[PDB]
Amino acid sequence: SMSRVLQAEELHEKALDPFLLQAEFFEIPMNFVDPKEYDIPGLVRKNRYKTILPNPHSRVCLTSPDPDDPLSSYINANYIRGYGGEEKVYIATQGPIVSTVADFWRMVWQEHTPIIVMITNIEEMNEKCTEYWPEEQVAYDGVEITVQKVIHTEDYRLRLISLKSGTEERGLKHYWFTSWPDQKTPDRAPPLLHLVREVEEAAQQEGPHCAPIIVHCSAGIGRTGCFIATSICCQQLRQEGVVDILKTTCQLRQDRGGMIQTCEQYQFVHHVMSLYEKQLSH
């Protein structure tokens, strides 16, 4: 809808102009949905935040266990377009609560999701996100989840997970990013960039027609939108030699209201992209 193409020199200077950044950010509509789109008894138990709801045109619908029941088919999640408008590249969702853990795994299974990206600090667990993976092994709703290995790196922990239901078995990579900064300054950008690059490479290893990548922290809009926006813009930078963070933010919000929730998040994405542009200039 809106658009501000940035070439390299404008990108680095823009990252350093908080006044222009807030002027631009606070012109972008949030595109939140009216809670009356979802007048469904008991729905509020499936939502972590009662006012942050999935926009109806792009929402994910669970067809298990009862497609004919709007409560059991509801999950707070939206399909997100990727670079170039590609459909269903990501799913942005809230961090599961106790009552929607099983719903989350049903979504993973139904969508064939190969990658989950979680952006929740250790100090924030079981407040901003229920721990929804086992130590070893659990089953929800006929899907056996088994954590086959844990790889601790500086910026994140990667869990290789097996999913079995009946005579089917699938792999899953769970990236748990633990380096989200309270201070969104440039010296905190690199970990997020490496996380983006690592996931791009993992996604490419899945081959053609990759299934949706799930991204969440808590509400599925703020940090989630930052991760997705950076991923989209890294591709745009490599392919077009420019970034359009404003357009990308608008695209995100068209898919899920509220993506990139604060001005400090928006400036952070500019810092990350400024960093990447420099790297790419060797």
Resolution given for this structure, in angstroms: 2.0
Tokens of residue 59, six digits = 């929402």
Could you give the residue ranges of the DSSP H alpha helices within 83-221?
101-111, 189-205
Cβ distance 143 to 162 under 8 Å? no
CA distance linking residue 262 with residue 268, whole number of Å: 10
CA distance linking residue 257 with residue 7, whole number of Å: 27
Question: Which residues define the annotated binding site for substrate?
Answer: 182, 217-223, 261
Question: Quick check: bond before 65 cis, omega within 30?
Answer: yes
Cβ distance 229 to 243 under 8 Å? no
Question: Is 35 strand, coil or helix?
Answer: helix
CA distance linking residue 53 with residue 63, whole number of Å: 19
CA distance linking residue 6 with residue 3, whole number of Å: 10
The domain total for the chain is: 1
Tokens of residue 72, six digits = 């059991």
CA distance linking residue 117 with residue 173, whole number of Å: 8
Question: Is 191 strand, coil or helix?
Answer: helix
Question: Nearest-5° angle of CA 136, CA 223, CA 1?
Answer: 135
Q: Which of 129, 210, 217, 233 is catalytic?
A: 217
CA distance linking residue 175 with residue 198, whole number of Å: 10
234 an active-site residue?
no
Cβ distance 186 to 195 under 8 Å? no
Question: Which residues define the annotated binding site?
Answer: 182, 217-223, 261
Give the list of residues 6+ apart from residue 15 with CB closer than 8 angstroms, or none: 21, 186, 267, 270, 271, 273, 274
Question: Is 97 strand, coil or helix?
Answer: coil
Total Cβ atoms within 10 A of residue 69:
11
Count of positions (residues) in the chain: 282
Tokens of residue 77, six digits = 């999640």
Per the structure, the complete domain to which residue 227 belongs is given by: 1-282
Q: Give the distance, in angstroms, between the CA of residue 257 and the centroid of all CA atoms in the same chain.
A: 13
Maximal C-alpha separation, the chain: 57
Cβ distance 119 to 219 under 8 Å? no
DSSP states along 202-264: HHHHT-SSPPPEEEESSSSSHHHHHHHHHHHHHHHHHHHS-B-HHHHHHHHHHHSTTSS-SHH
Total Cβ atoms within 10 A of residue 30:
12
Residue 139, strand partner residues:
144
CA distance linking residue 45 with residue 50, whole number of Å: 9
Cβ distance 51 to 127 under 8 Å? no
Of the candidates 84, 24, 14, 13, which has an alpha carbon nearest to the alpha carbon of residue 260? 24
Cβ distance 47 to 94 under 8 Å? yes
CA distance linking residue 176 with residue 147, whole number of Å: 14
How many Å is the Cα radius of gyration of the chain?
Answer: 18
What's at 130, amino acid-wise?
Answer: T
Total Cβ atoms within 10 A of residue 198:
18
Total Cβ atoms within 10 A of residue 132:
21
User: Solved how?
Assistant: X-ray
